[PDB]
Design a protein around this ligand. Structure first.
Ligand SMILES: CNc1ccc(-c2ccc(/C=C/c3nc4ccc(OC[C@@H](O)CF)cc4s3)nc2)cn1
Ligand SMILES: CNc1ccc(-c2ccc(/C=C/c3nc4ccc(OC[C@@H](O)CF)cc4s3)nc2)cn1
Ligand SMILES: CNc1ccc(-c2ccc(/C=C/c3nc4ccc(OC[C@@H](O)CF)cc4s3)nc2)cn1
Ligand SMILES: CNc1ccc(-c2ccc(/C=C/c3nc4ccc(OC[C@@H](O)CF)cc4s3)nc2)cn1
Ligand SMILES: CNc1ccc(-c2ccc(/C=C/c3nc4ccc(OC[C@@H](O)CF)cc4s3)nc2)cn1
Ligand SMILES: CNc1ccc(-c2ccc(/C=C/c3nc4ccc(OC[C@@H](O)CF)cc4s3)nc2)cn1
Ligand SMILES: CNc1ccc(-c2ccc(/C=C/c3nc4ccc(OC[C@@H](O)CF)cc4s3)nc2)cn1
Ligand SMILES: CNc1ccc(-c2ccc(/C=C/c3nc4ccc(OC[C@@H](O)CF)cc4s3)nc2)cn1
Ligand SMILES: CNc1ccc(-c2ccc(/C=C/c3nc4ccc(OC[C@@H](O)CF)cc4s3)nc2)cn1
Ligand SMILES: CNc1ccc(-c2ccc(/C=C/c3nc4ccc(OC[C@@H](O)CF)cc4s3)nc2)cn1
Ligand SMILES: CNc1ccc(-c2ccc(/C=C/c3nc4ccc(OC[C@@H](O)CF)cc4s3)nc2)cn1
Ligand SMILES: CNc1ccc(-c2ccc(/C=C/c3nc4ccc(OC[C@@H](O)CF)cc4s3)nc2)cn1
Lengths: 62, 62, 62, 62, 62, 62, 62, 62, 62, 62, 62, 62
C-alpha cells in the first residue's frame, strides 16, 4: 500500500450561499463606469494582468 | 503503508454565507467610477498585476 | 506506517457569515472613485502589484 | 509509525461572523476617493507592493 | 512513534465576531481620501511595501 | 515516543469580539485623509515598509 | 389621499442562508428516535398542539 | 394625506446566516431521543401546547 | 398630514450570524434525551405551554 | 403634521453574532437529559408556562 | 407638529457578540440533567411560570 | 412643536461582548443538575415565578 497523491486549488471559490432582498435598486450613470453585484468569481492568470471588478472613466490619452 | 501526499490552496474562498436586506439601494455616478457589492472572489496571478475591486477616474495622460 | 504530508494555505478566506440590514443605502459620486461592500476576497500574486479595494481620482499625468 | 508533516498559513482569514444594522448609510464624494466596508480579505504577494483598502486623490504628476 | 511536525501562521486573522448598530452613517468627501470600516484583513508580502487602510490626498509631483 | 514539533505565530490576531452602537456617525473631509474603524487586522512584511491605518495629505513635491 | 392598510406576519421565516461542510456525517439509532438538520421551518396552528422537531421513544401505554 | 397603518410580527425569524464546518459528526442513540441542528424555526400556536426541539424517552404509563 | 401607525414584534428573532468550526462532534445517548444546536428560533403561544429545547427521560407514571 | 405612533417589542432577539471553534466536542448521556448550544431564541407565552432550555430526568410518579 | 409616540421593550436582547475557542469540550451525564451554552435568549410570559436554563433530576413523587 | 413621548425597557440586555478561550472544559454529573455558560438572557414574567439558571436534585416528595 502506497497512497501517494496531491490535491491542489488555485483561485477556487466553493460553498457560497447568498440572499439579497432589496425593494428598489436604482443605478444612474453619466459618463462614468459602475460595477455592481459581483459574486463567487474565480480566476487564474499566467503572464497577464488579472483584474476583477475594476472601473475607469475618461481615459483620454490626449 | 506509506500515505504520502499534500493538499494546498492558493487564493481560495470557501464557506461564505451572506444575507443583505436593503430597502432602497441607490447609486448616482457622474464621471467617476463606482464599485459595489463584491463578494466571495478568489484569484491567482503570475507575473502580472492582480487587482480586485479597484476604481479610477479621469486618467488624462495629457 | 509513514503518514508523511503537508497542507498549506496562501491567501485563503474560509468560514465567513455576514448579515446586512440597511434601510436606505445611497452613494453619490462626482468625478471621484468609490469602492464599497467588499467581502470575503482572497488573492495571491507573484511578481506583480497585488491590490484589493483601491481607489484613485484625477490621474493627470500632465 | 512516523507521522511527519506540517500545516502552514500565510495571509489567511477564517472564522469571521459579522452583523450590520444601519438605517441610513449615505456617501457623498466629489473628486476624492472613498473606500468603505472591507471585510474578511486575505492576500499574499511576492515581489510586489501589496495594499488593501487604499485611497488617493489628485495624482497630478505635473 | 515519532510525531514530528510544525504548524505556523503568518498574518492570520481567525475568530472575529462583530456587531454594528448605527442609525445614520454619513460620509462627505471633497478632494480627500476616506477609508472606513476595515475589519478582519490579513496579508503577507515579500519584497514589497505592504500597507492596509492607508489614505492620501493631493499627490502633486509638480 | 518522540513528540518533536513547534507552532509559531507572526502577526496573528485571533479571538476578537466587538460591539458598536452609534446613533449618528458623521465624517466630513475636505482635502485631507481620514481613516476610521480599523479592526482585527494582521500583516507580515519582509523587506518592505509595513504600515497599517496611515494617513497623509498634501504631498506636494514641488 | 388616505393610504390605509396593514401587513402582518405569523410564524414566518424569511432570509435564511446556510452552509454545511461536513466530511463524515453518521447516525446510528437502535429503538430510539433521532431528528436532525431541521432548517427554515414555519408553522401556524389554531386549536391544536403545534410541535416542530420533537422526538420520543418507547411509548408503552401498558 | 392620512397614512394610517400597522405592521406586526408574531413568531418571525428573518435575517439568519449560518456556517457549519464539521469534519466528523457522529450520533449514537440507544432507546433515547436525540434532537440536533435546529435552525431558523418560527411558529405560532393558539389554544395548544407549542413546543420546538423537545425530546423524551421511555414514556411508560404502566 | 397624519402619519398614524404602529409596528410591533412578539417573539421575533432577526439579524443572527453564526459560525461553527468543530472537528469531531460526537453524541452518545442511552435511554436519555439529548438536545443540541438550537439556533434562531422564535415562537408565540396563546393559552398553551410554550417550551423550546426541553428534555426529559424516564417518564414512568407507574 | 401629527406623527402619532408606537413601536413595541416583546421577547425579541436581534443583532447576535457568534463564533465557536471547538476541536473535539463530545457528549455522553445515560438516562439523564442534556441540553446544549441554545442561541438566539425568543418567545412569548400567554396563560401558559414558558420555559427555554430546561432539563429533567427520572420523572417517576410512582 | 405633534410628534407623539412611545417605544417599549420587554424581555429584549440585542447587540450580543460572542467568541468561544475551546479545544476539548466534554460532558458526561448519568441520571442527572445538564444544561450548557445558553446565549442571547429573550422571553416574555403572562400568567405562567417563566424559566430559562433550569435543571432537575429524580423527580420521584412516591 | 410638542415632542411628547416615552421609551421604556423591562428586562433588557443589550451591548454584551464576550470571549472564552478554554482549552479543556469537562463536566461530570451523576444524579445532580449542572447549569453552565448562561449569557445575555433577558426575561419578563407577570403573575408567575420567573427563574433563570436554577438547579435542583432529588425532588423526592415521599
Ligand atoms: C512559502 N510558502 C510555501 C512554500 C512552499 C510550499 C510548497 C512547496 C512545495 C510543495 C510540494 C508539494 C508536492 N507534493 C507532491 C505529491 C506527490 C508527488 O509525487 C511524486 C511522484 O514522483 C510520485 F511519487 C510529488 C509532490 S511535490 N508544496 C508546498 C508551500 N508554501
Ligand atoms: C508556494 N506555494 C506552493 C508551491 C509549490 C506547490 C506545489 C509544487 C509542486 C507540487 C507537485 C505535485 C505533484 N503531484 C504529483 C502526483 C503524481 C505524480 O505522478 C508521477 C508519475 O511519475 C506517476 F507516478 C506526480 C506529481 S507532482 N504540488 C504543489 C504548491 N504550493
Ligand atoms: C516562510 N513561510 C513558509 C516557508 C516555507 C514553507 C514551506 C516550504 C516548503 C514546503 C514543502 C512542502 C512539501 N510537501 C511535500 C509533500 C509530498 C512530497 O512528495 C515528494 C515525492 O517524492 C513523493 F514522495 C513532497 C513535498 S514538499 N512547505 C512549506 C511554508 N511557509
Ligand atoms: C520566519 N517564519 C517561518 C520560517 C520558515 C517556515 C517554514 C520553513 C520551512 C517549512 C517546511 C515545511 C516542509 N514540510 C514538508 C512536508 C513533507 C515533505 O516531504 C518531503 C518528501 O521528500 C516526502 F517525504 C517535505 C516538507 S518541507 N515550513 C515552514 C515557517 N515560518
Ligand atoms: C523569527 N521567527 C521564526 C523564525 C523561524 C521560524 C521557523 C523556521 C523554520 C521552520 C521549519 C519548519 C519545518 N517543518 C518541517 C516539517 C516537515 C519536514 O519534512 C522534512 C522531509 O524531509 C520529510 F521528513 C520539514 C520541515 S521544516 N519553522 C519555523 C519561525 N519563526
Ligand atoms: C527572536 N525570536 C525568534 C527567533 C527564532 C525563532 C525560531 C527559530 C527557528 C525555529 C525553527 C522551528 C523548526 N521546527 C521544525 C519542525 C520540524 C522539522 O522537521 C525537520 C525535518 O528534518 C523532519 F524531521 C524542522 C523544524 S525547524 N522556530 C522558531 C522564533 N522566534
Ligand atoms: C401585548 N402586545 C400587543 C397587544 C396588542 C397589539 C395590537 C393590538 C391591535 C392591533 C390592531 C391593529 C389594526 N390595524 C388596522 C389597520 C387598518 C384597519 O382598517 C380598518 C378598516 O375600517 C379600514 F379603514 C384596521 C386595523 S386594526 N395591533 C396590535 C400588539 N401587541
Ligand atoms: C397581540 N398581538 C396582535 C394583536 C392584534 C393584532 C391585529 C389585530 C387586528 C388587526 C386588523 C387589521 C386589519 N386590516 C384591515 C385592512 C383593511 C380593511 O378593510 C376594511 C374594509 O371595509 C375595506 F375598507 C380592514 C382591516 S382589519 N391587525 C392586527 C396584531 N397583533
Ligand atoms: C404590555 N405590553 C404591551 C401592551 C400593549 C401593547 C399594545 C396594545 C395595543 C396596541 C394597538 C395598536 C393599534 N394600532 C392600530 C393601527 C391602525 C388602526 O386603524 C384603526 C382603523 O379604524 C383605521 F383607522 C388601529 C390600531 S390599534 N399596540 C400595542 C403593546 N405592548
Ligand atoms: C408595563 N409595561 C408596558 C405597559 C404598557 C405598554 C403599552 C400599553 C399600551 C400601548 C398602546 C399602544 C398603541 N398604539 C396605537 C397606535 C395607533 C392606534 O391607532 C388608533 C386608531 O384609532 C387609529 F388612529 C392605536 C394605538 S394603541 N403600548 C404600550 C407597554 N409596556
Ligand atoms: C412599571 N413600568 C412601566 C409601567 C407602564 C409602562 C407603560 C404604560 C403605558 C404605556 C402606553 C403607551 C402608549 N402609547 C401609545 C401610542 C399611541 C397611541 O395612539 C392612541 C390612538 O388614539 C391614536 F392616537 C396610544 C398609546 S398608549 N407605555 C408604557 C411602562 N413601564
Ligand atoms: C416604578 N417604576 C415605574 C413606574 C411607572 C412607570 C411608567 C408608568 C407609566 C408610563 C406611561 C407611559 C406612556 N406613554 C405614552 C405615550 C403616548 C401616549 O399616547 C396617548 C394617546 O392618547 C395619543 F396621544 C400615551 C402614553 S402613556 N411610563 C412609565 C415606569 N416605571
Amino acid at each position: 500500500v502506497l497512497y501517494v497523491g496531491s490535491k491542489t486549488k488555485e483561485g477556487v471559490v466553493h460553498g457560497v450561499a447568498t440572499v439579497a432582498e432589496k425593494t428598489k435598486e436604482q443605478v444612474t450613470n453619466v459618463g462614468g463606469a459602475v460595477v455592481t453585484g459581483v459574486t463567487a468569481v474565480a480566476q487564474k492568470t499566467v503572464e497577464g494582468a488579472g483584474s476583477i471588478a475594476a472601473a475607469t472613466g475618461f481615459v483620454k490619452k490626449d
